[PDB]
Scaffold this active site. Structure first.
Site, short mmCIF file in Angstrom:
data_model
loop_
_atom_site.label_atom_id
_atom_site.label_comp_id
_atom_site.label_asym_id
_atom_site.label_seq_id
_atom_site.Cartn_x
_atom_site.Cartn_y
_atom_site.Cartn_z
N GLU A 16 60.30 56.49 20.47
CA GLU A 16 58.87 56.63 20.63
C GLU A 16 58.40 55.30 21.26
OE1 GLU A 16 54.73 56.49 20.68
OE2 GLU A 16 56.06 55.15 19.61
N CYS A 63 50.93 56.92 15.25
CA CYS A 63 52.20 57.54 15.65
C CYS A 63 52.26 59.01 15.28
CB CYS A 63 53.39 56.81 15.00
SG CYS A 63 54.97 57.46 15.63
N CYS A 66 56.28 59.71 13.53
CA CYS A 66 56.14 59.56 12.08
C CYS A 66 54.70 59.91 11.71
CB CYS A 66 56.57 58.16 11.66
SG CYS A 66 55.51 56.84 12.30
N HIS A 70 51.25 57.39 8.23
CA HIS A 70 50.13 56.44 8.21
C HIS A 70 48.89 56.98 7.50
CE1 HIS A 70 52.00 53.41 10.76
NE2 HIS A 70 52.56 54.40 11.45
N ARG A 461 61.47 55.19 9.07
CA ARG A 461 62.03 53.98 9.69
C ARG A 461 61.92 52.74 8.80
NH1 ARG A 461 60.27 57.67 12.58
NH2 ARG A 461 61.43 58.28 14.44
N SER A 484 58.91 49.49 12.33
CA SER A 484 59.44 48.98 13.59
C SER A 484 58.93 47.58 13.94
CB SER A 484 59.10 49.92 14.74
OG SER A 484 59.80 51.13 14.64
N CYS A 528 60.14 52.79 17.07
CA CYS A 528 58.86 53.44 17.32
C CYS A 528 57.85 52.38 17.71
CB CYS A 528 58.46 54.21 16.07
SG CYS A 528 56.96 55.17 16.31
N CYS A 531 54.08 52.72 16.64
CA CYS A 531 54.08 52.24 15.27
C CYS A 531 54.10 50.72 15.20
CB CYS A 531 55.32 52.75 14.50
SG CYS A 531 54.98 54.27 13.59
#
Ligand code: SF4
Ligand code: SF4
Ligand code: F3S
Ligand SMILES: [Mg+2]
Lengths: 534, 267
Positions: A16, A63, A66, A70, A461, A484, A528, A531
């Site tokens: 991503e 994101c 994922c 969030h 992640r 990330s 990502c 992210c």
């Protein structure tokens, strides 16, 4: 044929977001590395002054890979700030959706993002489907036949003879490549499962929508709980349960056997991309205010010393900017965070990324499935130990093999298998609670004028945290510190390489024009960048 | 990447969260495998393509310069502040990339509220000067079909592409350049709770017995009455949509909704 010189990979695809990787290679081995994130959006800036209730809707758009994570972190963050203890069922439903997210996410990562680093899809055309079927049926309880696989081959053949390779255009494996090791048959099995995985992921994502309204970007969380009364009904639970059971079957009978076959063929990859330090936040709480109530527990490990897991102290997190495109060089704890963009172009003033560099007690920390798995293993988690030991035993390697690109990829599978099972346990606890007559899913709460809050999610992640300061009832500061960011952010003001940068050192590169080995390590972290940078 | 036979699609990613790309993978009858192998030729897409780096850039070039033509599908807003530096790919700014490629497409679809209207990064104070595609590239004559939502219903993208391929033209478009076949009705007029709305039966809170019984969410901020989308009709993932999950519509297919529709829990 040992290249000396730079290699740049920009764009890094099959991740991503927007990543640029730069390496220095000496005699065919990487001797230095930079991780450069090349898109900034500034959601933290945008949130200033808004209603804290609005934060999750904005931050979810950090994101869409994922997705939900969030929203969950922000809702946990404001729940915490507000002091509300959500109902049991809100915790169950939120956990179930998150477990579903992990299954969807990891399955897509292995097949649709990582596998093309290791599978030559065109060589699947050369395969014998009967032999391939024998192999597939020997690694899985699921019987696969020659005709099954011939159908896939047939389909691929038509696709390639049209001369329109689409997403396979200029693939590093076209024409053959010295770092691609699989035989045709194994490539065909992987390719069939890739394809299969495109339809199966629809069901894994649907499972989130059953309770959470839609995927991507769920719409069922509120401060104090969840909104989805329909989620209490036997019909919706049944619908969820059937999607979960099919998803788990795929994990257990398709994904993990494939992962094992490929790992076994690439056992030299136990030699590259290891890291030193690990952090994880734990996930799937019984108590929203106690991390140690989670199925996976938080922990911190330095220099691979898993006999001395340290407690996670949230105050020991600081985000550096010295090598990032932000003003100044001062690291900040997120409750005192700052997001002050200042671009200097690549390596201008030694800055090369839009990501901050989070450090824990000043150290760069890997987070994600390998951190979750290793730390949980070291905490005596019996499910993680069982699956991990079995994997290690099937590959015929020792535990030290986990500290590498192969290890990390395996860990992602291990975590998928464990969570797939634990979803069934949560589901049952949920059903049990409803049957006791608890039908409450949202609790009342009141907005404070001034408050501090933090929300913790262990996302696919790794350790995600959202941090708020409420002032005058509004967002005074809101800071995201994302997995990330930890893993793929740049150097800190102590010039410590980040986990991805350090893991690249020593990577062999057979062909500098097609540097798949760099992709293998980078992809193993499942980057990502939306992210990471937000 | 392409030639005759399947029409070529170049998919660009600007200032985006990849939620729009993910929505397309949720394609249902047809599924995304049918779409990639039989309907279309997906000739560039950074999320799932095999090539990376220079090989990826060469694939893009190959696709855009093809005598057979291509359709562009664009995700994300275009950061324009500071000469576009807040967003780069292959060390070119997104603005520059889009400026060069989009005028060459035979047709452009802006997919998602970021690409159509600017989206989340364009919300106040819009630090990167993010714009929707048509706003950003007005001066080069680009007129993308806007398929709005955050993310949109993938039914709407596939429906639009199929129309175009059949009719060699865009479908009827509304004043925000959205296909009327999908964006012609408010969410609200399609909503199962409309009888409660009409009766003045509103949930006062999410914990309330009124919410439990499925009363209208207007007092809790629902933006259905001011939002154009087909959500109650098509639903998402063949099974649900925000109001049926008990949560207000936040207006996500409308321009500037981040600022226009907030606070989300007020009307
Ligand atoms: S429209 Fe929404 S889902 Fe799509 S890229 Fe933008 S923020 Fe993500
Ligand atoms: S819940 Fe929203 S869309 Fe439905 S009737 Fe009420 S205001 Fe309209
Ligand atoms: S929030 Fe968006 S997905 Fe539909 S219900 Fe409202 S337009
Ligand atoms: Mg941040």
């Amino acid at each position: 044929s040992s290249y000396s010189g730079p290699i740049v990979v920009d764009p890094v695809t099959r991740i991503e977001g927007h990543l640029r990787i730069e390496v220095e290679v000496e005699n065919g081995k990487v001797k230095n590395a930079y991780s450069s994130s090349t898109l900034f959006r500034g959601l933290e800036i945008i949130l200033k002054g808004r209603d804290p209730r609005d934060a999750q809707h904005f931050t979810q758009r950090t994101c869409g890979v994922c997705t939900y994570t969030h929203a969950l972190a922000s809702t946990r963050c404001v729940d915490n700030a507000v002091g509300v203890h959500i109902p049991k069922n809100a915790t169950y439903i939120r956990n179930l959706v998150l477990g579903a997210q992990y299954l969807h996410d990891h399955i897509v990562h292995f097949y649709h993002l990582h596998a093309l680093d290791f599978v030559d899809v065109t060589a699947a055309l050369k395969a014998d489907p009967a032999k391939a079927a024998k192999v597939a049926s020997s690694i899985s309880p699921r019987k696969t036949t020659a005709a099954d696989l011939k159908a896939v081959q047939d389909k691929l053949k038509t696709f390639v003879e049209t001369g329109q390779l689409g997403p396979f255009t200029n693939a590093y494996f076209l024409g053959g490549h010295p770092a691609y090791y699989l035989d045709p048959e194994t490539n065909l099995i992987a390719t069939a499962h890739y394809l299969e995985a495109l339809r199966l992921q629809v069901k894994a994502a649907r499972a989130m929508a059953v309770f959470g309204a839609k995927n991507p970007h769920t719409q069922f969380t509120v401060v104090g709980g969840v909104t989805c009364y329909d989620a209490l009904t036997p019909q919706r639970i049944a619908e969820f349960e059937a999607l979960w059971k099919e998803t788990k079957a795929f994990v257990d009978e398709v994904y993990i056997p494939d992962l094992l076959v490929v790992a076994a063929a690439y056992k030299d990859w136990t030699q590259y991309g290891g890291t030193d330090n690990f952090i994880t936040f734990g996930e799937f709480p019984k108590d929203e205010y106690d991390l140690n109530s989670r199925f996976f527990k938080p922990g911190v490990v330095f220099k691979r010393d898993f006999k001395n897991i340290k407690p996670f102290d949230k105050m020991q997190i600081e985000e550096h900017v010295r090598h990032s495109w932000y003003e100044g060089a001062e690291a900040r704890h997120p409750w005192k965070g700052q997001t002050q963009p200042k671009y200097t172009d690549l390596h201008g003033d030694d800055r090369y990324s839009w990501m901050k560099a989070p450090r824990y007690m000043g150290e760069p920390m890997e987070t994600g499935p390998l951190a979750q798995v290793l730390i949980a293993y070291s905490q005596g988690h019996p499910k993680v130990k069982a699956v991990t030991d079995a994997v290690l035993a099937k590959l015929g390697v020792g535990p030290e093999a986990l500290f590498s690109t192969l290890g990390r990829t395996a860990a992602r599978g291990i975590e998928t298998a464990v969570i797939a099972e634990y979803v069934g346990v949560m589901l049952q606890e949920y059903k049990d609670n409803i049957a006791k007559g608890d039908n409450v899913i949202c609790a009342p709460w009141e907005m404070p004028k001034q408050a501090e809050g933090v929300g913790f999610v262990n996302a696919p992640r790794g350790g995600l945290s959202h941090w708020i300061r409420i002032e005058d009832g509004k967002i005074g500061n809101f800071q995201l510190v994302v997995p990330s960011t930890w893993t793929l952010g740049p150097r800190c003001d102590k010039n410590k390489l980040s986990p991805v940068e350090a893991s690249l050192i020593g990577t062999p590169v057979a062909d500098a024009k097609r540097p798949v080995e760099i992709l293998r390590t980078v992809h193993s972290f499942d980057p990502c960048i939306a992210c990471g940078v937000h | 990447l392409m030639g005759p036979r399947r029409p070529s699609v170049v998919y660009l990613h600007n200032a985006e969260c990849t939620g729009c790309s993910e929505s397309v993978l949720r394609a249902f009858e047809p599924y995304i495998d049918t779409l990639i192998l039989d309907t279309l030729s997906l000739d560039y897409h950074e999320t799932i393509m095999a090539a990376a780096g220079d090989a990826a850039e060469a694939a893009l070039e190959q696709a855009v310069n093809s005598p057979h033509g291509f359709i562009a599908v664009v995700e994300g807003g275009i950061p324009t502040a500071a000469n576009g530096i807040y967003g780069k790919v292959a060390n070119h700014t997104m603005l520059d990339i889009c400026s060069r490629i989009l005028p060459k497409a035979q047709a452009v679809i802006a997919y998602g509220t970021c690409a159509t209207f600017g989206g989340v990064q364009a919300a106040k104070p819009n630090p990167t000067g993010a714009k929707g595609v048509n706003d950003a590239l007005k001066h080069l004559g680009v007129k993308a079909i806007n398929i709005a939502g955050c993310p949109p219903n993938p039914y709407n993208l596939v429906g639009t592409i199929v129309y175009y391929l059949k009719n060699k033209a865009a479908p009827e478009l509304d004043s925000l350049n959205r296909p009327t076949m999908f964006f012609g009705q408010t969410v609200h007029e399609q909503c199962p709770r409309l009888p409660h709305f009409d009766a003045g039966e509103f949930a006062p809170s999410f914990e309330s017995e009124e919410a439990r019984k499925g009363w209208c969410l207007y007092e809790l901020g629902c933006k259905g009455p001011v939002t154009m989308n087909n959500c109650p009709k098509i639903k998402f993932n063949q099974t649900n949509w925000p109001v049926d999950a008990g949560h207000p519509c936040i207006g996500c297919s409308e321009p500037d909704f981040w600022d226009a529709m907030t606070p989300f829990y007020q009307n």
